[PDB]
């Protein structure tokens, strides 16, 4: 299962 | 950073003339990820060639397996042609069934 | 034994095609089981190992959405990265992400990972305590300040200590047939003459999983550290791996040379000689 939590976190 | 591709050409199973097999071209250690890979049968590119999903190693360099179904023979020569930004001209590596 | 789940993202910006190409692959140990490619006709997560096919439509739909949002986020990360290094938009640049968890034989978390590379060089990484980052750069120090203010590490920890391990245990159980398996190499030596007095002995390991393996040639029990030709371990295309090692030996004395194969699926290393 991929980490959906960080899918909005930009560098 | 730029890294040149390592290339191996080989069969899935021990070559047997008349037996269907898979011809593989394994490209690895390269960066950036754009890469051109053809499989050649007597110098002409094979049409139905699939490849694996792009992944990369622990040093971040990419790898890919290009492969097609084939039936080897005494006379027929197989090879792999690779171009990459780090290569001045295409690189061709011939298939040796003992390697 | 010990096990790992890992996801690999690659994002490649394209100068006039506004969105980057985004590819993800997911692995349990050395078994690829999912993929996503933003360049497909209809991008969605797809199964790549048999034991993941039984997952329901909500598994695929949710993961597809996760990748779609991650692709857009990567797109914006790439701009921010170009801004941090004063690179022009017309360039093509690469952002790779690697994360996941390791579990021991009991299924307890051993270690979490979450790190990034920009154009192939380490950029920022979550530390082993899952509460801090190591920045490799002045640019990555900007990302660190932002992720410190956002308490990003605590979000990575939530996943790595929670659902990451939880789904890995579920996969190991669903693909127990092929994941608790270690397939030992089936091995043989071949003989290839060079001249009247020289010959190559080649030690073959075929059909083994996982990829980690050591082949070592010995003459009279002495390791041939130099004088051994070794190819990189390579995929057979059927989720097993191949590798060989070779020595050039004097004709007549081939039985003095012995090949040792060590692999996770071999409780005792195999010793091989021609024929």
Numbering used by the authors:
A (entry chain Q): 1 to 11
B (entry chain A): 1 to 99
C (entry chain F): 1 to 275
What are the paper's exact sentences on this?
CD8+ T-cells provide broadly cross-reactive immunity and alleviate disease severity by recognizing conserved epitopes. HLA-restriction was further validated using peptide pHLA-I tetramer staining for 7 IBV epitopes that elicited the strongest IFN-γ+TNF+ CD8+ T cell responses and displayed >99% conservation among IBVs circulating in the human population between 1940 and 2023. This included 2 HLA-B*07:02 (B7/NP30, B7/NS1196), 3 HLA-B*08:01 (B8/NP30, B8/NP92, B8/NP479) and 2 HLA-B*35:01 (B35/HA231, B35/NS1260) tetramers.
Although representing approximately 11% of HLA-B*07:02 ligands, 11mer peptides such as, the NS1196-206 peptide are considered long with regards to the structural constraints of the HLA-I binding cleft. To establish whether the NS1196-206 peptide also bulges out of the HLA-B*07:02 peptide binding cleft, we crystallized and solved the structure of HLA-B*07:02-NS1196-206 at a resolution of 2.4 Å. Structural analysis showed that the peptide NS1196-206 interacts with hydrogen bonds to side chain residues of HLA α1 and α2 helices. Considering the anchor residues at the extremities of the peptide (P2 and PΩ), the 11-mer peptide bulged out from central P4-Gly to P8-Leu to adopt stable conformation and providing a surface for TCR recognition. In terms of HLA-I and peptide specificity, polymorphic residues Asp-114, and Glu-152 form hydrogen bonds with the side chain of P6-Lys and P9-Ser, respectively. Accordingly, the NS1196-206 epitope forms a stable conformation that bulges out of the HLA-B*07:02 cleft, which is in accordance with the relatively robust B7/NS1196-specific CD8+ T cell frequencies. At 11 amino acids long, the NS1196-206 peptide has a length that surpasses the typical 8-10 amino acid length of HLA-I ligands, leading to a bulging confirmation when presented on HLA-B*07:02 consistent with other long (≥11 amino acids) HLA-I ligands. In the case of B7/NS1196-206, we observed a diverse TCR repertoire, which may be reflective of the low mobility of the bulged section. B7/NS1196+CD8+ TCRαβ repertoire was dominated by TRBV27-TRAV38-2/DV8 expressing clonotypes paired with a variety of TRAJ and TRBJ gene segments and was detected in 3/6 donors.
